[PDB]
Design an enzyme around this catalytic site. Structure first.
Site, PDB file in Angstrom:
ATOM      1  N   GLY A 107       2.100   7.519  45.412  1.00 17.62           N
ATOM      2  CA  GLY A 107       2.614   7.835  44.096  1.00 17.62           C
ATOM      3  C   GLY A 107       4.065   7.473  43.954  1.00 17.62           C
ATOM      4  O   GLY A 107       4.577   7.384  42.806  1.00 17.62           O
ATOM      5  N   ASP A 129       5.259  -7.980  48.198  1.00 19.88           N
ATOM      6  CA  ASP A 129       4.781  -6.802  47.463  1.00 19.88           C
ATOM      7  C   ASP A 129       5.812  -6.377  46.433  1.00 19.88           C
ATOM      8  O   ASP A 129       6.594  -5.442  46.627  1.00 19.88           O
ATOM      9  CB  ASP A 129       4.445  -5.650  48.427  1.00 19.88           C
ATOM     10  CG  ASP A 129       3.776  -4.512  47.716  1.00 19.88           C
ATOM     11  OD1 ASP A 129       3.306  -4.729  46.565  1.00 19.88           O
ATOM     12  OD2 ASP A 129       3.675  -3.403  48.280  1.00 19.88           O
ATOM     13  N   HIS A 164       1.227  -4.344  44.750  1.00 22.02           N
ATOM     14  CA  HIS A 164      -0.022  -3.649  45.038  1.00 22.02           C
ATOM     15  C   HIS A 164      -0.395  -2.568  44.019  1.00 22.02           C
ATOM     16  O   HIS A 164      -1.540  -2.105  44.015  1.00 22.02           O
ATOM     17  CB  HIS A 164      -0.032  -3.069  46.452  1.00 22.02           C
ATOM     18  CG  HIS A 164       0.726  -1.779  46.580  1.00 22.02           C
ATOM     19  ND1 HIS A 164       1.960  -1.685  47.203  1.00 22.02           N
ATOM     20  CD2 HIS A 164       0.391  -0.515  46.209  1.00 22.02           C
ATOM     21  CE1 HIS A 164       2.368  -0.425  47.175  1.00 22.02           C
ATOM     22  NE2 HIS A 164       1.431   0.304  46.589  1.00 22.02           N
ATOM     23  N   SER A 218       5.221   4.679  45.564  1.00 23.35           N
ATOM     24  CA  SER A 218       5.323   3.242  45.777  1.00 23.35           C
ATOM     25  C   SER A 218       5.616   2.507  44.509  1.00 23.35           C
ATOM     26  O   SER A 218       5.187   2.934  43.425  1.00 23.35           O
ATOM     27  CB  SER A 218       4.023   2.748  46.420  1.00 23.35           C
ATOM     28  OG  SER A 218       4.088   3.188  47.761  1.00 23.35           O
ATOM     29  N   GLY A 219       6.370   1.417  44.629  1.00 22.66           N
ATOM     30  CA  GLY A 219       6.817   0.699  43.442  1.00 22.66           C
ATOM     31  C   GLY A 219       8.183   1.172  42.980  1.00 22.66           C
ATOM     32  O   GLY A 219       8.869   0.447  42.270  1.00 22.66           O
TER      33      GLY A 219
HETATM   34  N1  LIG Z   1       6.404   6.153  53.469  1.00 24.71           N
HETATM   35  C1  LIG Z   1       5.254   6.225  54.170  1.00 24.71           C
HETATM   36  N2  LIG Z   1       5.283   6.502  55.472  1.00 24.71           N
HETATM   37  N3  LIG Z   1       4.143   6.167  53.459  1.00 24.71           N
HETATM   38  C2  LIG Z   1       3.995   5.649  52.223  1.00 24.71           C
HETATM   39  C3  LIG Z   1       2.823   5.901  51.558  1.00 24.71           C
HETATM   40  C4  LIG Z   1       2.553   5.326  50.318  1.00 24.71           C
HETATM   41  C5  LIG Z   1       3.496   4.514  49.722  1.00 24.71           C
HETATM   42  C6  LIG Z   1       3.190   3.961  48.391  1.00 24.71           C
HETATM   43  O1  LIG Z   1       2.799   4.850  47.570  1.00 24.71           O
HETATM   44  C7  LIG Z   1       4.692   4.272  50.368  1.00 24.71           C
HETATM   45  C8  LIG Z   1       4.934   4.819  51.615  1.00 24.71           C
END
Ligand SMILES: N=C(N)Nc1ccc(CO)cc1
Length: 248
Positions: free
Chosen positions: A192, A90, A41, A194-195
């Site tokens: 930020g 993903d 994503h 994620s990944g």
């Molecule tokens: N970890 C969560 N509860 N929220 C969350 C939000 C964004 C991302 C990707 O950037 C991963 C997880």
């Protein structure tokens, strides 16, 4: 990362920053001299491949470092099953434009095999330069954050996401996903991050158990982070990299 602490330089030397038009947008994990794993994503089709960069060997994103290296991408390969937000698959393989040289600050993380088990409750660490709370950016000079989180099974995780849920949201932790965090929240990965890596300890080593994928507002109760399981893609990653860039 919310509720974590600053790592010190070199601690997580597989962590990379992925920027798009110069702005950090996602984490990734170095897995060989020329390949990084991140989340599909993070690479929407409308973005231009030449506008991405990957920064390796970084600790404080805003600080100059002679150990850090910045690269563009030769290839972005999302898993073909990734359909839309929340989907399985993903995960993306990124081939750097040129190989890097490993150093004290730039090292790959071992990938798990297809049937690698990381047990419920294992204390792994998620890292990243993402937000330090919902809608709050990590402050300059942006030292990498780290957070120890226990693994939470997808079954438990699905039950927690159902609590006080919006019925119009699927919030469904798929078979290729695991969770990590705390039922009472406060500690989690944020936008930020994620990944980026969920690094788990096994037999004195560290493995890439998960790739930070999605969740609700970071640190909310009953909303632990959801991660794509690297083991679910071990076969695909190995087949792809072996065909595209065999080790001579
Ligand atoms: N970890 C969560 N509860 N929220 C969350 C939000 C964004 C991302 C990707 O950037 C991963 C997880």
């Amino acid at each position: 990362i919310t509720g974590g602490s600053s790592a010190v330089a070199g601690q997580w030397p597989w962590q990379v920053s992925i920027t798009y038009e110069g702005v950090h947008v996602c984490g990734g994990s170095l897995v060989s001299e020329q390949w990084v794993l991140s989340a599909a994503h993070c690479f929407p089709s409308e973005h231009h491949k030449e506008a991405y960069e990957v920064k390796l060997g970084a600790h404080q994103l805003d600080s100059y470092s002679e150990d850090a290296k910045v690269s563009t991408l030769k290839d972005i390969i999302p898993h073909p099953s990734y359909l839309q937000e929340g989907s399985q698959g993903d995960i993306a393989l990124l081939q750097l434009s040129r190989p890097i040289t490993f150093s004290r600050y730039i090292r790959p993380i071992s990938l798990p095999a297809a049937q690698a088990s990381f047990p419920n409750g294992l204390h792994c660490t998620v890292t990243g330069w993402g937000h330090v709370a919902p809608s709050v950016s990590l402050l300059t000079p942006k030292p990498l954050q780290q957070l120890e989180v226990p693994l939470i099974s997808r079954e438990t995780c699905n039950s927690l996401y159902n609590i006080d849920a919006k019925p119009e949201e699927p919030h469904f932790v798929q078979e290729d996903m695991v969770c990590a965090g705390y039922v009472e929240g406060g500690k989690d990965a944020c936008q930020g991050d994620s990944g980026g890596p969920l690094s788990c300890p096994v037999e004195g080593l560290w493995y890439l158990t998960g790739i930070v994928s999605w969740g609700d507002a970071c640190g909310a109760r009953n909303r632990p982070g959801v991660y794509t399981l690297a083991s679910s893609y071990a076969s695909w990653i190995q087949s792809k990299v072996t065909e595209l860039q065999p080790r001579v």
